[PDB]
Design a protein around this ligand. Sequence first.
Ligand SMILES: NC(=O)c1ccc[n+]([C@@H]2O[C@H](COP(=O)([O-])OP(=O)(O)OC[C@H]3O[C@@H](n4cnc5c(N)ncnc54)[C@H](O)[C@@H]3O)[C@@H](O)[C@H]2O)c1
Ligand SMILES: NC(=O)c1ccc[n+]([C@@H]2O[C@H](COP(=O)([O-])OP(=O)(O)OC[C@H]3O[C@@H](n4cnc5c(N)ncnc54)[C@H](O)[C@@H]3O)[C@@H](O)[C@H]2O)c1
Ligand SMILES: NC(=O)c1ccc[n+]([C@@H]2O[C@H](COP(=O)([O-])OP(=O)(O)OC[C@H]3O[C@@H](n4cnc5c(N)ncnc54)[C@H](O)[C@@H]3O)[C@@H](O)[C@H]2O)c1
Ligand SMILES: NC(=O)c1ccc[n+]([C@@H]2O[C@H](COP(=O)([O-])OP(=O)(O)OC[C@H]3O[C@@H](n4cnc5c(N)ncnc54)[C@H](O)[C@@H]3O)[C@@H](O)[C@H]2O)c1
Ligand SMILES: Oc1cc(Cl)ccc1Oc1ccc(Cl)cc1Cl
Ligand SMILES: Oc1cc(Cl)ccc1Oc1ccc(Cl)cc1Cl
Ligand SMILES: Oc1cc(Cl)ccc1Oc1ccc(Cl)cc1Cl
Ligand SMILES: Oc1cc(Cl)ccc1Oc1ccc(Cl)cc1Cl
Lengths: 259, 261, 261, 259
Amino acid sequence: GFLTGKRALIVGVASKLSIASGIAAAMHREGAELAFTYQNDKLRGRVEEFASGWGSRPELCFPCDVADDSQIEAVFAALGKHWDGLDIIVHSVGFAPGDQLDGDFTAVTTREGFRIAHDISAYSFIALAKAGREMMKGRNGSLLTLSYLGAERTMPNYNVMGMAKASLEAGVRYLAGSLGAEGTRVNAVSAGPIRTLAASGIKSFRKMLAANERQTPLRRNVTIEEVGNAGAFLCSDLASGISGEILYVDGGFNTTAMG
Amino acid sequence: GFLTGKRALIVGVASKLSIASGIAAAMHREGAELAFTYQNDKLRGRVEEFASGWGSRPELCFPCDVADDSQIEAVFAALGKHWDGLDIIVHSVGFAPGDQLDGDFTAVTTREGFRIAHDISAYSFIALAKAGREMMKGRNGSLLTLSYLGAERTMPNYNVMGMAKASLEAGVRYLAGSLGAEGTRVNAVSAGPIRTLAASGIKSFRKMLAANERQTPLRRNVTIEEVGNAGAFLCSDLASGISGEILYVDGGFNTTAMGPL
Amino acid sequence: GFLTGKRALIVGVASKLSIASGIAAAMHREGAELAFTYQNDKLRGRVEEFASGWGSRPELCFPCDVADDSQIEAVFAALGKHWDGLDIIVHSVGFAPGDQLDGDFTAVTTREGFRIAHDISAYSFIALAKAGREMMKGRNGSLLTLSYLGAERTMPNYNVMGMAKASLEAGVRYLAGSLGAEGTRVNAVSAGPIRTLAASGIKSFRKMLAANERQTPLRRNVTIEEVGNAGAFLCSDLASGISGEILYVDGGFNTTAMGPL
Amino acid sequence: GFLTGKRALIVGVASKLSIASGIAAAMHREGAELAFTYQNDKLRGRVEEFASGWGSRPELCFPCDVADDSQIEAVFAALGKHWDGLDIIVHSVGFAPGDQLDGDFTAVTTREGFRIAHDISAYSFIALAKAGREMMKGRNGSLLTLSYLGAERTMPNYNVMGMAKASLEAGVRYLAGSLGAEGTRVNAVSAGPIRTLAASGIKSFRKMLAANERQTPLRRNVTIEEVGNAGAFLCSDLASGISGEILYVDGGFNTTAMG
Ligand SMILES: NC(=O)c1ccc[n+]([C@@H]2O[C@H](COP(=O)([O-])OP(=O)(O)OC[C@H]3O[C@@H](n4cnc5c(N)ncnc54)[C@H](O)[C@@H]3O)[C@@H](O)[C@H]2O)c1
Ligand SMILES: NC(=O)c1ccc[n+]([C@@H]2O[C@H](COP(=O)([O-])OP(=O)(O)OC[C@H]3O[C@@H](n4cnc5c(N)ncnc54)[C@H](O)[C@@H]3O)[C@@H](O)[C@H]2O)c1
Ligand SMILES: NC(=O)c1ccc[n+]([C@@H]2O[C@H](COP(=O)([O-])OP(=O)(O)OC[C@H]3O[C@@H](n4cnc5c(N)ncnc54)[C@H](O)[C@@H]3O)[C@@H](O)[C@H]2O)c1
Ligand SMILES: NC(=O)c1ccc[n+]([C@@H]2O[C@H](COP(=O)([O-])OP(=O)(O)OC[C@H]3O[C@@H](n4cnc5c(N)ncnc54)[C@H](O)[C@@H]3O)[C@@H](O)[C@H]2O)c1
Ligand SMILES: Oc1cc(Cl)ccc1Oc1ccc(Cl)cc1Cl
Ligand SMILES: Oc1cc(Cl)ccc1Oc1ccc(Cl)cc1Cl
Ligand SMILES: Oc1cc(Cl)ccc1Oc1ccc(Cl)cc1Cl
Ligand SMILES: Oc1cc(Cl)ccc1Oc1ccc(Cl)cc1Cl
């Protein structure tokens, strides 16, 4: 397939619904060799089982809480014992404390909630780019992250995650501008709403889903298969002319203003 | 490849250098069956030649000056006698009278120059969408056009083509909003500068090339192979979640405000 | 006020509801001396009447169908026998054939509907810039046009006016890039929906109004007084650092993707 | 003038060159009653002297390190002793550690430098909005912050400040969406490059100045007088139809690609 010979590290698998799972499946289908991180020991077993079904194995699964620089560096040190280089990093991770995402933005947003949202959802992408730079050197590889329309325009409850996604998208451009000379491309998919574990935590998520379904040009919601294909493409040599890009996979909802 | 089973109409091949040629080659490589238009008889011979190299033939090549509604409609009438229906239309066509793109925007832009630029570069995409709607019904296919950063931000000489491209990009969105419910996706690639017949017509194009090479994140100009691959992907079922999109294939130049120190 | 000493030409007054009327009233309040155009003799009487209420007079009112270059040029020739120079032009004009704005975009949009929409709604701003350039020479003045969110994102029925507005907004940028060196600033206000004569022609306009009221951050529709004030500011020396800008006066509606729960 | 009867708190005066000083001068000219904060006791004296010349006085100057929630709350507590309400808050501050802004983005950006840049340059705007909400209640007032093109497109060395500004501009929109119903408008000016104390800290600032000068439509750089007039306008009832907006005052540079 169009990723044959590529090696990809995938950060963010939590369940069969995860966007990272859609990306993993597509990349494997297209021939990529895969490795994984898991956030903690409660998710470890499930990620290990998933890896075994995507051509991978438990010894290519590594612990990584992206709050922790030491753990992030330890991923690449461990991976480097198995692989003499790396082509792709997929960053499919986000978090803000629940109290940040339930209520009036001004009332509920706090300094610490803000700190955490930006640290986990935006800085962690830079952290992976940094720690993986040496393994990716000379491979003309790519980095991919995931964003959401909330970075550009507002909706109830998404709140400070919108600020963190805006930070993240700027990061995509600054990373592209920095890593491009040595051959690395850096892009994101901005997905439409998809029912995932994380999506469940936004109390009004179903309203986002509904608005997208009724107003998006395709008049249906997107799938992790569609996000995965877009991500697979962006991390392939087919996309070698594309860097710094935020690619929407939302049926075109972002191009509408039918409020 | 990821287009085997699809049928595409390619509008805009002029030479081996054309972006439409890069797209045609990628789509052919990926398994698409191709048909072609040529602007007029000055380009017929070359388009027929190229088509035969891309799995196609002269009887799947049709005259089409996109200023002319009846020529446009006659393409699909003629094509529909060979093809059941149609999955893909690639719109890779632009024009403004030469004097519109040489000198101060305010001084050289005219009503007639404006009319023509918008008619050929923007309305013609809508015309193809309309004329091909019947052949594309039920096929869950897609439309692709080509744009340039000049639509969003200014540079010397691009001038009224910048207005026409802005119109075109809005057109992508209005077409996507109109045709999506029945299954058709509508997108564009906004390409970085590439040496083509039309590009060579722009004074200071050489400088645009040098500017991009120095300042673009990838520190190199893009190719019609790279634009071709992006266009092929957008018109494939791999992109079934994507409509209304303006996808930049420019190495990231559009994301920069200044070049390196 | 902050416009005392300035002279402004206002194109687009039709009724007391017009955006151009809100702009005219605000500029008059702030001390500007005003001149006016009227599209044709159907609006001459009301425009002359309104002008006399804004410190002006029939002799500073001129016929101008912006489809017609010779009429446009005759405005400035005639005005120049009263005024030795001009600081400001306000361009508050739009048109597309009615059937272009009623129904499915792909089905109802035509080449001729497209031509007219872009000719009147977009090129005419360029035409004013060109024709008034001599009179604005050395005055460090400004141009203002009016746009709508439909240029960037889609909604029912706005259709080809959305393409024309996108063209116009690029026009703002290219004019700014061309005329800035000699001192002229060029901007637009992108207004939220307002009940005007033209707006009343759009079916489902009442839905656009209700949509904005519920979803806009300020939870209320905007007024021609608010648009008028923003336009007055943009055309004043208070805004001397501002050119090429599309300023939204829509209560923030454009910054929202969904309304409140 | 068009701010007569308005009371404004201005956060960010450091010297006669400050953007905040340009905004203060314009607002005072237009009739606003002003109060001020100062970052530390080194700047206290200078801010006090400036206040006296802008119709204000030393007792309307308050300490505020915007890293500190209690100090921020203490500003409004103290100001409330003097004013029974507040109309305007101007947020004109930023900071990132110098090592973040000198060199390759991927190489020099760190988790802590990221945290600080976002905390001081972005979250602090939300903090002021929150702390001032009661004093602003029912006055149909406004909030203003300052941003920079670096939020949208990249340039050498601006680096993580670009991410922080992108966060800030999303903040402008989320605040607008939250505070609008009760009558508060929220906007920013995105200024072109201006020689200020903070600007001099960016190693390549003169290259930014030069690019703006040669490529901006007006072919000259903007002044704090021009930024202050725009900010004064945005915080006036003349701008009562405008919220959630990022108003560029850069001579049009942002609209150019080659210029
Ligand atoms: N509608 C959607 O689901 C949607 C839409 C647009 C963008 N996104 C983004 O897609 C990405 C994936 O989210 P998802 O929707 O697939 O949900 P998900 O629950 O399947 O995945 C979220 C991932 O984030 C991981 N994570 C959270 N905190 C972590 C930490 N400190 N350290 C390491 N890992 C951590 C979780 O373990 C999990 O694997 C996120 O960036 C999300 O913001 C989701
Ligand atoms: N070359 C670049 O750097 C670049 C960058 C961005 C976008 N584009 C766009 O790509 C497309 C141009 O292709 P190109 O650069 O490969 O140049 P090209 O010269 O190879 O092709 C231009 C095409 O436009 C056709 N055409 C012109 N007027 C026509 C008319 N009335 N009717 C039918 N066909 C007509 C021409 O026959 C030709 O096939 C345009 O849309 C262009 O604006 C080009
Ligand atoms: N009303 C709104 O909600 C709204 C919102 C955003 C933008 N706008 C724009 O504001 C501007 C003014 O429109 P309006 O809402 O005040 O409606 P309006 O009916 O009051 O004014 C429209 C003007 O266009 C003039 N006009 C039309 N065709 C002309 C032609 N060939 N030559 C010269 N003049 C011509 C008309 O004579 C009239 O004066 C337009 O550009 C409109 O697109 C309106
Ligand atoms: N000068 C420019 O070219 C330019 C351009 C665009 C935007 N901006 C933005 O305008 C504002 C910059 O101010 P400036 O250029 O007038 O420089 P400046 O040095 O005059 O002001 C910077 C202010 O930030 C204050 N500050 C820094 N850290 C603080 C903290 N922890 N607590 C409280 N106050 C703190 C400083 O005391 C100072 O008053 C910033 O938001 C800046 O990012 C500047
Ligand atoms: O960014 C998202 C956007 C949508 Cl519509 C749905 C889920 C998203 O992802 C998250 C949302 C909230 C938290 Cl706490 C964590 C994550 Cl990963
Ligand atoms: O849009 C373009 C942009 C670039 Cl950088 C180069 C070529 C382009 O294409 C054209 C430019 C001018 C004319 Cl008259 C016709 C065409 Cl097809
Ligand atoms: O652009 C507009 C946008 C809105 Cl919401 C309302 C009115 C507008 O103005 C017009 C709309 C249609 C036509 Cl035919 C002419 C004009 Cl002036
Ligand atoms: O944002 C800015 C943009 C420019 Cl062009 C110049 C100065 C700016 O303001 C800062 C830059 C760096 C640091 Cl550490 C702090 C501040 Cl306030």
